[PDB]
Symmetry: D2
Subunit: 433 residues, 4 copies
């Protein structure tokens, strides 16, 4: 059964309970909500329906909120500081890369440029200032209400748009914490050369990364974009942080109930690079065939996961422990690695080595039972309490057999923290069911 997770952007064609239950069945794991449209009571109801389908069925799913972030769209440009922040020689581009201009003069409220290439300029096009740094907040007074709605509803993840550096992340995170959303994970969307160059620092600040290669492409040389993707997936796998692969996934399916062979290859290679999750935007949100897309997407995942291997080859404790747990599991042919988590780090720590076995992750934490839904190959499980290391062993032996994920006489490797604080994974323990 598939291991990599499917994020499905849900809008009004798909928000019903009956569809949401269908889409969970087809392999949806996370509802993405893209607040570049809609009204709050609509969205608020879109959440409740999923949360109803969840009670009604026993399925887990996570909720992820998208923020739009900063934009810049003789023509008239939205951004008043355009003239300040641009510089002589700079390369402006309009309409996702279509026309490139080089800045010759800026006088007053005017950036006068020389057009470098032919193109048909229209209404409301994108302006990209590659290199150039923009003084717009990561999170402007306008998208901030989106966030607050998000904390209020208690979404699991926030994907933040147009992240260019550490500071940006920290400013999304200081917002959330101002409103009770401190336990909400931030996924940073690298959509530009600046964010790209600042990735390692964007990565230490965030909880994950959304690889938006479409957006990124506009800004950097084509022959660099896959390599950006691969690097960022690899850097995320190492850090133990979720990474979604997001843009241009199965786009044809907004018009067709079957994907291009080049889309499928492109989704399969991202999974092979090592993602946690693959994303469906309009295919599930606006298009004519949303349940078709989730289902083909799920067969691509399943077919791809199932040929992939484990990945075992200062040195840290959690790293030694969790690498041994997976090495030992596969050695002993265990179907499962059963893990105790508070905030998820150690289910994430095990997953980093791409286990054959399923991670069944026991938490008493609700947010982290949901959040873990976005981690590759992980099945979260909310438990009432784990009182001791032997209790954990005893409980997880019950839930493993009970899970149907293993049977009597199966070997199961159990991973947890014992006499340590939350941050750490420190003991591994093999058991026969």
């Amino acid at each position: 059964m598939k291991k990599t997770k499917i994020v499905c952007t849900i809008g009004p064609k798909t928000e019903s309970e009956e569809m949401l239950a269908k889409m969970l069945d087809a392999g949806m794991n996370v509802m993405r909500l893209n607040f570049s449209h809609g009204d709050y009571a609509e969205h608020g109801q879109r959440i409740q329906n999923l949360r109803n389908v969840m009670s009604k069925t026993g399925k887990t799913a996570a909720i992820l909120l998208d923020t739009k972030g900063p934009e810049i769209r003789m023509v008239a440009v939205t951004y008043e500081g355009f003239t300040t922040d641009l510089s002589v020689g700079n390369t402006v581009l309009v309409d996702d890369g279509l026309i490139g201009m080089e800045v010759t003069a800026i006088e007053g409220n005017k950036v006068i440029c020389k057009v470098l290439n032919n193109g048909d300029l229209g209404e409301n096009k994108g302006v990209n200032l590659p290199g150039v740094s923009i003084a717009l907040p990561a999170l402007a007074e306008k998208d901030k209400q989106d966030l607050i709605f998000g904390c209020e509803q208690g979404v699991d993840f926030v994907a933040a748009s147009f992240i260019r550096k550490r500071s940006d992340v920290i400013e999304i995170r200081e917002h959330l914490k101002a409103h009770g959303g401190e336990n909400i994970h931030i996924i940073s969307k690298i959509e530009n050369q600046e964010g790209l160059n600042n990735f390692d620092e964007i990565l230490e600040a965030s909880d994950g990364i959304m690889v938006a290669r479409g957006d990124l492409g506009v800004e950097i040389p084509v022959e660099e974009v896959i390599f950006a993707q691969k690097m960022m997936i690899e850097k995320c796998i190492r850090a133990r942080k979720v990474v979604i692969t997001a843009t241009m996934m199965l786009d044809s399916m907004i018009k067709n109930p079957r994907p291009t062979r080049a889309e499928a290859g492109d989704v399969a290679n991202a999974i092979l690079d090592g993602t946690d999750a693959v994303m469906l935007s309009g295919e599930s949100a606006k298009g004519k065939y949303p349940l078709e897309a989730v289902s083909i997407m799920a067969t691509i995942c399943e077919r791809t996961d199932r040929v992939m291997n484990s990945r075992l080859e200062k040195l840290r404790i959690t790293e030694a422990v969790c690498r041994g747990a997976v090495e030992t599991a596969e050695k002993l042919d265990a179907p499962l690695i059963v893990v105790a988590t508070q905030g998820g780090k150690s289910a994430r720590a095990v997953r980093k080595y791409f286990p054959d076995a399923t991670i069944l992750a026991l938490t008493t934490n609700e947010k982290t039972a949901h959040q873990l839904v976005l981690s590759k190959g992980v099945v979260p499980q909310l438990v009432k309490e784990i009182t001791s290391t032997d209790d954990f062993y005893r409980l997880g032996k019950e839930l493993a057999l009970q899970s149907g994920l293993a049977h009597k006489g199966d070997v199961v490797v159990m991973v947890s923290g014992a006499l340590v604080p939350s941050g750490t994974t420190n003991t591994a323990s093999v058991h026969v069911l």
Copy 2:
């Protein structure tokens, strides 16, 4: 410099010497002649031109003749107008080549469309535009049921999943194209729609009848039968062309990457070339820049491990053909750059050619000089993805051109090589001459010695 080779389909937009020189200058290595169109006088000239440029410049290049192969076409419609088909509708295929079609029925060029197809099977028209499962067969008719909405034009292609189409390996015309190619002396022949071992042997027997015994046969796997017979098809051929677009029509979508990755992997093991072909930078037929999706697709096939990536319409008829070769070259360069050598029943040649590459690497040699007759040893070194350029010395002119298709090899025609010490002596003179290395560079040299041409058996480390 780029190690993977670029095969460019030359058309009349590119066939000139001044444009062919530019293409060799942007990074084209192999000229593909698509005999699904054109004529012998034209292709004859396209050949002479390249041979002229290669003479004019001193560049090397290979010439690949692509066969059109067996097809099933639907034929003509009433008044030559497209008809609109619709789901659940009965449609019917007729074997009568003079029945003109409408939205109820067409005729198909293939006389055994019934004799072969079977009640229940899938029929797809215009490269999978329209799908249809069979519900009956009677007489000269395949009575079908239409599964989705489309418009049927005239003369469309028919893809018959599963159906062992008993069409022959060589078309009526295909034989005369092959004969043209033997006469012209082309280096490779890429043969379309290879379903089994016997299909290969039928092209090889054809070429052998005509002085083509030394021509390499690149089999195009374009359907499920060919896939299922890959290992045997590969034992029989000299290389493989992965046709992704074609296979995409023929097999489930989630299988194609894996059909590609699987075929490239086995080609490398077999020491035979592999071209990754359809659906590369097709957008560049209208656009002077590629998709991010396209440049990505290309990079992943180089990373999978191809020898060569192929330009079709983008260099044959597209509006921006020199741009394709250049961005296709920068993608190559960029990708090879970050690739590693892969070193981790005995075979003497595997043994020495793996050592010689592992040593090159440890000693930081710029070059591996290899001595070949038919290219095997240079192909056997290439199998471990050396960092080092393989400079391969031949006295055989054909295998000198043929070798231009292999990854990161640079062929060089030499007068004779008289002995093992002479090889070492001559290859150092040419290694310095090549500008691929310099004084005090180490150079591993690979060759056979007191052995027949099959075998590569000795290696030698030299400081220039």
Copy 3:
């Protein structure tokens, strides 16, 4: 500090408390009681002196009772006068125990001497002093030709190299000695002349009979038959004593090293103690420094991988016992200090314990703390030759004592460990208080959880 354990034979010149305490200081770990000698009253006070030194000092040692064994000896000569035998002469052994021998004939204590032997067989008398070849077995006579000049004394040992001897597993006195062994509650019994599995089973039965079921049987391999059946013998035993001198008078000399190395290796694999025993520092029976060659042979046996090295008469009855222990122990520390862990069907215990050592090494842990009931999981950890010391906590005393014989384990006896977390709390307390580790140090802790005695399943890492 040294990791390989020293077994010291205790006799009357070193049996005192003051001396026992010095030797414990020098490196003694195990007191061997050789029952070739002494009475039960002596060995009893011997055992008592050591127990009082352990009381008074908190040192732990073990007590290993070494049987004398069944034997074939020659018996009494005319007048008690040694005789000189000549190369080539005839000589006869007689099963007849009444015959007072001379220059032509002796009696041997073994009734089955004619049965066991064969024409062509070699008989060695007095530690291979004299050899002879069997020329005819007639009646109660074995008639031989003398292979070399030598002097026969009374009551000499006989070795039948290559021959199976149907002597019993235990001499009569041996059975009477073993019950004393049970009474006294010794930790080990080393059983002499072990030839086959059945011998070991017998011995186990005997001890089991007298409440001695927790006493470990160390099988002494002293000849070819025993070497032949070593695997099935090691299976039935708790460990092995490699008696090199005996093997050297029984099997070809060039074989004895590989006998030693094979048996230490299979003991390590089976997770069972091995003692390297005879001919260690015998020169120190007379001198206060060992030979160069003596020092090398001990060192090589530790590098082979023994748990323990043995002193015999040079700590029991020699003139420099305390110097023997000391230099023995300096060879020990010197050799241990340069050995490496050994990390490279699959079981749970082996998987866990090898992860324990491997992780310990990676994380620079001074200590691996194990909780044992019967000693196994300390021995399972010891198999990989860790750099860390193994603190092994038991509530079981006999095992706390037997674990003293195991390479580089520091046993220690505890009230109780109630749970797995209790274990990790307890072992950190004792790890710090042991002075083996200090605050900041990592400590890998190994145990069994929700499993019965047999099994080591879990492992935790902690910083002190």
Copy 4:
């Protein structure tokens, strides 16, 4: 069968063509002439005797000159009677070679005794028989306190544990020995008591002045100074002899094995021969079979990786010199048999030669044919302990001689090789001819090509 080589000391009881011939049959590879004994006529005849046997049989051997070397000895006693020294007594050595001593004073041969020694230093006399500690040095007297009881005889050896002695590199008769050594064209010279690089540089200059520039210098490491300077000594030597007995009287016991194994390790890595030399089978001087412990000591020295193992008194002045060679050789065959290649700063020869052994093993080659001018490539391929035999081809007869000492090489003097292919051609003729390999065997062939003497840069695989 065996690969490790045997140096045998030839003395009176063994010097005859009949004897030497059986010696060679039994395992002898090198004749050691020990120049602590015997006039030049004697050694001259032994030299001739051996060269006769070789000629008359086609056998190869080498001849090695073992210098006596510089010494400190005690001198003459009153009336020439042994004096018994008592522990705690005062005892003085005098630099006055006029004095005739007794139980309180002796003269020594060494004038620098007083200089080199220090209060607190240990003096040993008669191979460690009596030890003493310096209490004061006054004038030409080193006043001591005797450490243990013993009879000092006359003309006894003195060892100064850990003291740098400024005796010269060479004794006066040593120089005259080395000149005879040159006239005789011996193949090696094992120089005695080598303690710093400058000593070797001297011995080399002496041989060079007498036309012995082709003679290899084996440095004997006999004390702590030699050991601390072993890296630069090894570097200026062609090889090493480990004098264990002497190291035993000079450095801490527990340290001697390690000194051995270190020095064997470093000679392997350096591609220079190493001989393990003293106290191997000394018991066999009086006895026809060796000791268990002696057998073990030889086997371990072989597993450490020696080229050669040395006999002394056993073959020179023993009772059973041919018994000794035989069991030594059985010990060799038996141990060599169970050892493995060692495959697992970036240089050419090391790469080619590792690859060759590496390739030979993969392909199971019985044989590696090497072409050598001064033996280096034989010694380079030997470094990895190939399973295969090295058949080493030279036109140089000295190296064909010296290569006799290298582990598992079979020297072959050939009339020429004119090219690399000429090599490959001849190496198969000889490989088949040699009975070592047979039709169908793989044979790996290693040489230099387009390179001067120093370098091994080409390897080739051939089927016979």
